[model samples]
Target: PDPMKNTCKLLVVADHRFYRYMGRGEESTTTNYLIELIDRVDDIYRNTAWDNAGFKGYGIQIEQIRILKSPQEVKPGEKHYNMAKSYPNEEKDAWDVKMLLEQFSFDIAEEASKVCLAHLFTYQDFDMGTLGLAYGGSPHGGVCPKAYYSPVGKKNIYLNSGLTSTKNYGKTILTKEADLVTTHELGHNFGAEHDPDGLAECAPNEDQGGKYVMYPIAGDHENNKMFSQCSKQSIYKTIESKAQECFQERS
Candidate 1:
C-alpha cells in the first residue's frame, strides 16, 4: 500500500432504517435518530473539545451521507431481539427471531452496497451511517469488511442505540451523551479504537472533569459530551489507520 495515497476521502451512507427511535412506531426510526444525531456532532467534531485534531486532522472530506430506507419489511433478528430484550420485556424465541431475520435480511448492510452507488468519491466529510443490524453481540457499534456485509459490496458500520431506555433508568443520557456515543461509533467506522490507555479513559481530568469521550459513566454532564485531547489523538490515529486501509482496498 502506498503510504502517500493513505490520505483519502470517504462517504457516509446511512441506511435510514437502522436508527429507529425507541417508540416512534416508525419504519426507519433508528436511521432517523442517527441522522439527527450525526448532524448534531458536526459542530462538536469541528470546533469543540470533542474535536480530535489529529484524526482526519484538517478534516475529513465526506462525499455525502445517503440514508437508504429498507425497500421491504424487516424483521427483528437475534441482534434486534437481543437489543429488544436488553430493553426490558421484549422477547422472541429462536424460530420467531429467524422469521424476523428473513423479512429484515436484505435490509442488512449487505443489500445497500450491492445496488447503490448514488454517492461516491464526491468529497464531503465521511462515509458510513447507513443501516442494517447495527450493534452485534458486543464491541458496541462499528463497521466491517465488504465480504461479511452481505448484499454485494459497500462499507458497513453497525451503530448501536445511543439513546437512553428503560434499562438505563436513573442513568444519565446527558445532552452530550448521545452525541458522544454516536461519535464513538463513528470513530470505529472511521477505523479508530477506544482510548484504552489515556487519562480520558479514566474520566475526570486534572481539573477534576471528564478527561475523554471514551470514559465510561452512567449519566450525562454539561461537559460529558466533549472529547478530551488524548481522546482526540487516539481517534486521529485510528483515522490515519482507516485512511491507509481505504487506499489499500481501493488500489
Candidate 2:
C-alpha cells in the first residue's frame, strides 16, 4: 500500500434498459457509452476538493464496466415477488433503492477490491424523483438489511455503492442528469452526505456553479458538478478513518 498514490478503483454495472439505450444492442457500443459517461464522471471527480482534502489527484480508476441481463424473471409466489412489485411501483420506491443495493452487493460477493456501482436507467418516474440510493461509505459501518454485504476486515468489502435512475417523470433524463446523478450516488459511497441548504460555503450560487453535488434536492446538473468543501471534508475523514483500506493501491 503506497500512501503517495491517489486513485479509487471502481467497477460499473448497467441494467438492460441502459444497455439497450446505447443503440445497436452490442456490448462494444455499451462499453463506449460507459466510457463517454465515465469521462464526465471522472471530470467531476477531477475536482479541487481532492487536493484540498489531501488526496492529490484523487480520481476514479475504473476497473470494469459491465451490463447486466434483464432482472430475474419473477415468479408469482416467490419471496422476492413482493419486492419486485413494490420496489418499482408508481408509489413509494424507497425499497427500489434498497433492492438495488442488495442486488449489486449480491452480484459481486467475491470481489473485494473495487467499489462497484450499478445504474438502472429505469424509465419510470419513482416517488419524488428518487434518483439515487447508496450505503454510507464506511467500511462496514453502513446498515445492511440483507446478508449480501459483509462487515468484515480490511477486505474493503462494502455494500457501499448504489443505484440511480434516469428519468424525470416519463421524460428521459439526459447525459448531464445521468452523469451528475452517478457522481452524486458514488459520492455517498465515498462518505459524503447531502449538502445542507443554508450552508453558504458549500451551496454555491448559480453563478458559482449552483448547488453542490451532494445537494439532497436536485437542481441544474450543469452547475452542480463540483463536490462542496463539506463533501471533501467528509471524504477525507473516511480516508483517514483507516476504514478505507480499499484505497490502498490504485494498481
Candidate 3:
C-alpha cells in the first residue's frame, strides 16, 4: 500500500519549433528520445500489478526532458504566426496545439512534486494540411489535457510532428512506435478515459484485439498492446484521487 513511498515527477517540454521540425538542431536528439520513452514508462510502472483503494506500487519519474525556447524564440520578428493569431477560431483551426497550450502554460516551473507537462511540437511547423488533415490522419495531431488540474497544479501533455509515421516519421522512434504514443498521452495524465466504443469496462468485448490503454485509435491495429483492467482500475482511482497532489515524501 505504500506505492513505492510516493514518487511522481514528469516534465517533458520540447518546442523550440520542436527542434526546428525534427531536423534536430540539438537537445541531444530530443533528450535521448525522451530518455527512451522514460525507460519504457518506468518499465510499465515497475512491472504492473498495481492495486486500487488500498494502494500498491505506483510510480513515475522523469524530472526533465528539457528544451523550451519559445518566447517566439527570442523576439526577432516575434511571430509564431502572430502568436497563433491569439487563439481560438476553433483553436486556430487545430494544430498549433491550442496555440502551444496558450504559449507554454505560463512557462511551467513550480513543482512541489507531482508535475507533468509533456509539450512537443512540429509537423513541419503546425500544418495538419491546414486542417484538411492527414499525416497520422489528424485529429489535430496532438492535444489531450482537458484539465486534470493545471491552474498551477500541473499535469498536461501535448505532442506534435504528427506524432510520427505517416509512412515513417523517421522510423517511429526507432520502432518503439513512439512508445505507444507516449503511453497513450501519459494515460491521460493518469486519470485515463477514452474507450471510444466498447464499454465492458473501458473498452472491452474483444475485436481489434481488445485494444486497450485508453483506446481512442489503435487504428491500423498495430497489435494493440493492452493496458486494461479498466486501465488498471482507472489508474488506481487516479493515484488515490490525486493523493495530496500525486504523492511525495521521498526524502
Give residue 185's lDDT in candidate 3 (0 to 100): 56
In terms of lDDT, the poorest run of 10 residues in model 2 is 138-147
**What ranking emerges by lDDT with the best candidate at the front?**
2, 3, 1
Candidate 3 lDDT, tens digit per residue, 171-250? 22333545665566555556555565646655665564656655766423433554666667666654654544445443
* lDDT for residue 244 in candidate 3, whole number 0-100: 49
lDDT of 2 by residue, 75-124 (tens): 66432311334454426533456655555555454552334333333333
Give the best candidate by lDDT. Answer: 2
lDDT of 2: 0.59
What does candidate 1 score on TM? 0.46
Expressed as tens digits, the lDDT of each residue in 29-96 for candidate 1 is 54455346546765555454224332332223333444444322325542331222321223311113
Query: Candidate 3: where is the Cα deviation over 4 Å?
Result: 18-50, 56-62, 70-183, 188-199, 204-213, 217-229, 233-251
lDDT of 3 at 109: 23
* Residue 16 miss distance in model 1 (angstroms): 11
**Residue 215 in candidate 1 has what lDDT?**
45
Of 2 and 3, the candidate ranking higher by TM-score: 2
